[PDB]
Amino acid sequence: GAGKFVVGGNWKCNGTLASIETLTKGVAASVDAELAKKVEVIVGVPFIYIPKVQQILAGEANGANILVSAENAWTKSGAYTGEVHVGMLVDCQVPYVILGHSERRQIFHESNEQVAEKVKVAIDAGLKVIACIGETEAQRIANQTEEVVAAQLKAINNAISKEAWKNIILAYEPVWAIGTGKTATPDQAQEVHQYIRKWMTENISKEVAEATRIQYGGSVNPANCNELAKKADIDGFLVGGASLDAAKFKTIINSVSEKL
């Protein structure tokens, strides 16, 4: 893609005030002004720790180079005990939100349409979004990779305007490579990213397709980030476990070099 390389660190349900202070300081320290010009860096933080991370970044020399993202959001205010609304994120000056992550689609049964509604409400409120898509092991075995991803994308596109895509980062999760014993190769990852690019080109426009960053959201570590970054349609990463270690995350952020 033609978009600026973007690396997000999804901390998932991990962290303590102490570990997060060390991590946040390490992440900010790794992205100075010069590097920030070539890579957008985002950290996905558990709701309760967002204020702490914001506080830490405020005191860091490179704090402005690290953007805070929530890991989910709800779209209805009122009688929904336990949920954090999109509006609360905006109220708290959180610029990003990760939506439709495979863990929420599977464990919390978020459907294509429910994810699309979240994306729609989030963007309408001004949030930028990392929208997660991807097929399961069963779906890939059934050779439904393209059909499944297309359906996920269509649900999202049907809900928003062409202009709304300007805030969207897509993250491809090869769910079929998650605890299955099957690892996605750069070639396999690129094959799906290429088709996502094609889907956007066919249904929206070539311009939107090329402008939209498609992050690879499979297993990313310091040992495979460069090989993956070499792929034409991988415009960044949504890192899992490795994002909890500032040193590992640093190596991944720097793999943007493969694009220069």
Added chain:
Amino acid sequence: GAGKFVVGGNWKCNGTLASIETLTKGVAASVDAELAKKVEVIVGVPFIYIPKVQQILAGEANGANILVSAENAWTKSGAYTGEVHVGMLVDCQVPYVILGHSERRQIFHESNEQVAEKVKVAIDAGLKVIACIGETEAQRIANQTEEVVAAQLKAINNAISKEAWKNIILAYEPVWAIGTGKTATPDQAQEVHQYIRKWMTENISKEVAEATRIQYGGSVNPANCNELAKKADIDGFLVGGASLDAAKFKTIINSVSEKL
């Protein structure tokens, strides 16, 4: 109940930094030392606003009289994007957590067993819990109130030790009468509260049954709180909409005048 009157204000999915600052200050202002001796006051806050509420309370004269509770919590750390686990609440010094609220049991399909699991890990971590139970309209007309409530309670008891019950406050939600058009009378509420007490007495012990506070968690407001507070087994309230108004909330807190 022989337990201390306890009033929880479940803010659910509502609030902004501005509205919460005004509300928190109003709630704290409404509970001085003398009233605090009669009523334990808890506020259920959206995850992202917990730090703010904590900060506000620390700066108010009566701040120590108001306890902060989360509105939900996940079982543990790990690959659960969007979730906040019990350990994070303890790490942030949050003393309470509301679990099994009807909105989560119905909307997010939390089963009796799943809720029980959460209660168990919450208490293991050191949290105090407001565990919600209650039957639907379909279950009530089918005359299954006792069996349904018994099953919800059994799931919880099966997962924890006798001593773990010290940390538990039960909240009965007459789901069949919350915004349905049906009004739960004080007599109807007392009847279910009595049976909850009876269930604990036969399934655990009379000591635990009497020590465990049973809050009424149906629709509570300034107009109906006193008649409910007069009931022998209504040891407090878990207030919904009315908790977003300091004046209405303190009116409800003061219904403890029916106890003394």
